[PDB]
Ligand binder design. Structure first.
Ligand code: 7WE
Length: 119
């Protein structure tokens, strides 16, 4: 990551952009598996295997509470959603395919956020 992503403290202005990115993911048709935590009853060994679960509702709470100090930390939580999904599910699973498309969408939006940070 570039040095601004790693080092520049997030401001309130930055948080308006992070909220916009999060809302765009939550509205995407293929974000349906990631809106809320994985239900253990739908995946019985999931919480024994996935040591750091993440989901978009948890990220929404963290954004509201100003949990993130650096953009890197916000990107790391987002990336957990996708990496956990691809770690647990086979490549032909609908969940895995959602992670592939939604991560590409996140990267597009993230690049937009980084470009606008200076202006
Ligand atoms: C209440 N429920 C049915 C909604 C729901 C919430 C999350 C998900 N997402 C899941 C599920 N299982 N697994 C192995 C995953 O990796 C992912 Cl992302 C699906 C439905």
């Amino acid at each position: 990551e570039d040095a601004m992503t790693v080092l520049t403290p997030l401001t309130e202005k930055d948080y308006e952009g992070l909220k916009r990115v999060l809302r765009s993911l939550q509205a995407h048709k293929m974000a349906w598996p990631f809106l809320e935590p994985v239900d253990p009853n739908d995946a019985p060994d999931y919480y024994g295997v996935i040591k750091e679960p993440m989901d978009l509702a948890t990220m929404e709470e963290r954004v509201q509470r100003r949990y993130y100090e650096k953009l890197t930390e916000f990107v790391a939580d987002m990336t957990k959603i996708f990496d956990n999904c691809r770690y647990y599910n086979p490549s032909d699973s609908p969940f895995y395919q959602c992670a592939e498309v939604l991560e590409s969408f996140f990267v597009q939006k993230l690049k937009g956020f980084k470009a606008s940070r200076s202006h």
